[PDB]
Design a binder for this molecule. Structure first.
Ligand SMILES: [Mg+2]
Ligand SMILES: [Mg+2]
Ligand SMILES: [Mg+2]
Ligand SMILES: [Zn+2]
Lengths: 221, 169, 151, 143
RNA sequence: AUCGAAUCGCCACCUACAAGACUGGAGCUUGCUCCCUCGAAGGCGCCAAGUAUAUUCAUGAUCACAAGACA
């Protein structure tokens, strides 16, 4: 992952500025696992670079016990003669989502592999993703519009924690620290947000009046 | 709180051929259907609407179930529900959406310059206020650096370097 | 009724009428707004001279398929448009082997046409706004739905 | 040698004091095409038919929307390894590049969700273009 | 330094959080009434640093990868 000295030297020779590819960051909290994965897989095949965060807060319909049992049935499948080379049962929730997307992809083609490698999965929100830009959601894969609220539902992090995932507490503490840092920084800059809001308000009295009338016509003033 | 589906409740049609029109519940068939009518709208005669396609508004006129057209019209005119609804922001947003939808290239240009003109004057007003009360990143950085800079520059050696390298310029 | 072999025969759509303001969709001046002056005879290409002072577009012919003729028009009945003939854009054959070079006659035609076009724009009630309209540059933004727009 | 922090301090103080709330303005060359992506070819479970391409265009999500683009020019841009002949090779030497284009036109909408069918001039679009950018221009214009 | 390339929206206002059986706020009458910023916009950007007194654009000759691209 570390760039080669040749690549750093070429970048210095060209004098190019810092570059970031067009990447969509999806917050997977309260998102249905299969519906989000199907949507993500289609977008990956269409050529989008997608990074998903908070994978541990994905949701699966039904009780946690039956979802844990379903994974345990998946875990029991292994090549008897040689468990190495057998199915690799990843426990991390981000790895669970990646496997679900992978099964929805044609993983045995170069095109399918390119789509799969265009996806990055995280538990929680890592610092390199926090400040990159506004996160997105999938409206047709959201719990509050997909599940009937009476039905019990499973949280992916809780399901994974009891089937082998060992970093549930680490992710929870990191998420707690991140929200506290974000809340403090959002408590700050409120004066900046309020000042800009008042600046826009005062602009109406200083700008040409026919321009105001156009704004009122199109519902902006 | 949410607005109930009751006889006399005013609703807006969410989707379909009557999208963004207003009517009155007038009657309830079952858990899924109602009988909407609005005398003042041309296309809003008494018809059946599914409850999934209606947005209950905050106004309820005083009518009975399966009321006559005259009784509905009198109640609507007396209650002033449509006039009150016209003054809200949601109604203005709905009307502005139609204006954008039927806008021409010239109208799109006029909105663009109007919004940019407001954007320019917002920047002017913000700059005037930010000069006095530092709230932006650069003004805040300057205000923190100023006190240490003045102390660091008020030395004899600082004066000599400033004068020598400025007179050289 | 009009003979199909006559220079006066045309099939051009109504939106590309003389005096209308067109958006250029291709070529060196893509995205620029311009004013339609005329159509060359024999169902030929349009001639646009959206004033070079406003946007840099000179008197150039353009196929009507490479232009969006907006519903916003300008009354250019005071513009002569007669000297703009098919012969203006013809070129002599080149034999077998930095300010832009413009022939004097082309320069005079541009001068007179643009001056009259500017005057007609001034005469319009919304002329100052339409002059800014001609200066504006059209572009396809992220999120744009040109197929859904009126023009 | 004197430390550079002093001159940097003076320059940083001047720039911070002279900073205004200026914004970034997109005054570059305009984009005159809608951006799309090649989803693949026409196919059934039996296999694909490479003579017809399927292009998904941003903001085109209805069959009525895709109808508006019928007959429009479609261009796939890529690059080779060597600089070969292009249009206006002699007239405009600045156009010479490894960049290449393959052209086509929209024939009909595909499905109900804004997908359109595209036929390329003579040959079919390469399979390496699947998932890559396609440019849908606004000409020929019916407006 | 080969190297000509495909990509074509920027931000130090989105880039914090949570709830959709309901988070603008009250009252009691508990589904109605009243108050408000009136509950259906993240800000900019799209060619004069701003809506005016303006201003060089061509012959790159009618489409051609935008012949350029640090916003
Ligand atoms: Mg719900
Ligand atoms: Mg409430
Ligand atoms: Mg190029
Ligand atoms: Zn009621």
């Amino acid at each position: 992952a570390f760039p080669s000295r040749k690549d750093a030297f070429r970048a210095q020779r060209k004098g190019a500025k810092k570059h970031r590819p067009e990447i969509i960051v999806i917050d997977l909290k309260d998102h249905v696992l299969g519906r989000a994965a199907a949507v993500v897989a289609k977008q990956l095949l269409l050529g989008k670079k997608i990074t998903v965060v908070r994978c541990e807060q994905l949701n699966i319909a039904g009780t946690e016990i039956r979802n844990k049992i379903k994974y345990l049935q998946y875990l029991r499948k292994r090549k008897l003669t040689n468990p190495t080379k057998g199915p690799f049962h990843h426990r991390a929730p981000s790895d669970v989502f990646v496997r679900t997307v992978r099964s929805m992809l044609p993983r045995y083609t170069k095109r399918g592999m390119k789509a799969l490698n265009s996806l990055v999965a995280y538990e929680g929100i890592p610092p390199n993703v926090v400040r990159t830009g506004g996160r997105v959601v999938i409206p047709r894969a959201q719990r509050h519009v997909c599940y009937r609220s009476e039905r019990p539902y499973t949280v992916l992090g809780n399901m994974c924690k009891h089937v082998g995932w060992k970093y549930s507490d680490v992710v929870a503490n990191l998420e707690k620290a991140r929200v506290e840092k974000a809340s403090r920084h959002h408590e700050k800059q409120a004066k900046l947000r309020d000042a800009w809001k008042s600046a826009r308000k005062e602009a109406l009295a200083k700008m040409p009046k026919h321009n105001v009338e156009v704004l009122k016509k199109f519902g902006y003033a | 709180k949410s607005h109930y589906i009751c006889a006399g409740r005013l609703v807006r049609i969410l989707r379909g051929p009557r999208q963004d029109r207003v009517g009155v519940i007038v009657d309830i068939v079952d858990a899924n259907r109602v009988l909407v009518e609005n005398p003042e709208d041309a296309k809003m005669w008494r018809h059946v609407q599914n409850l999934k396609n209606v947005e209950p508004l905050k106004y309820c006129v005083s009518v009975s179930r399966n009321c006559s057209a005259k009784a509905l019209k009198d109640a609507l005119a007396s209650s002033k529900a449509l006039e009150k609804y016209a003054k809200t922001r949601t109604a203005a947003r709905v009307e502005a959406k139609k204006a954008c939808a039927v806008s021409t290239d010239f109208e799109r240009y006029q909105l663009r310059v109007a919004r940019r003109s407001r954007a320019h004057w917002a920047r002017k007003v913000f700059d005037e206020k930010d000069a006095k009360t530092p709230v932006s990143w650069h003004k805040v950085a300057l205000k923190k650096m100023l006190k240490k800079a003045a102390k660091m520059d008020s030395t004899e050696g600082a004066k000599r370097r400033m004068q020598k390298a400025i007179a050289a310029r | 009724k009009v003979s199909r072999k006559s220079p006066e025969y045309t099939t051009l759509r109504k939106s590309c009428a003389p005096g209308a303001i067109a958006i250029i969709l291709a070529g060196r001046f893509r995205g620029r707004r311009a004013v339609i002056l005329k159509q060359l005879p024999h169902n030929g290409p349009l001639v646009v001279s959206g004033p070079m002072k406003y946007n840099g577009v000179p008197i150039r012919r353009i196929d009507s398929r490479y232009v969006i003729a907006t519903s916003t028009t300008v009354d250019i009945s005071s513009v002569d448009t007669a000297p703009i003939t098919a012969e203006v854009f013809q070129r002599p054959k080149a034999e077998k082997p930095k300010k832009t070079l413009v022939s004097d006659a082309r320069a005079q035609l541009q001068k007179k046409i643009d001056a009259a076009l500017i005057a007609a724009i001034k005469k319009d009630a919304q002329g100052k706004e339409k002059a800014g309209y001609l200066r504006s540059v059209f572009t396809v933004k992220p999120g744009d739905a040109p197929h859904r727009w009126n023009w | 040698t004197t430390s550079k922090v002093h001159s940097q301090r003076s320059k940083k103080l001047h720039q911070l004091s002279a900073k205004t709330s200026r914004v970034n303005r997109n005054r570059k060359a305009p984009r005159l095409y809608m951006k799309g992506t090649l989803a693949g070819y026409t196919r059934g479970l039996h296999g694909q038919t490479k003579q017809t391409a399927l292009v998904r265009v941003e903001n085109v999500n209805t069959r009525e929307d895709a109808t508006w683009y019928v007959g429009k020019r479609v261009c796939y841009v890529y690059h080779g390894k060597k600089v070969k002949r292009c249009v206006r090779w002699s007239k405009a030497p600045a156009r010479r590049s490894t960049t290449r284009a393959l052209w086509g036109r929209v024939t009909r909408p595909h499905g109900n969700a804004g997908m359109m069918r595209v036929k390329f001039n003579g040959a079919s679009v390469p399979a390496s273009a699947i998932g890559r950018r396609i440019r849908v221009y606004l000409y020929p214009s019916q407006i």
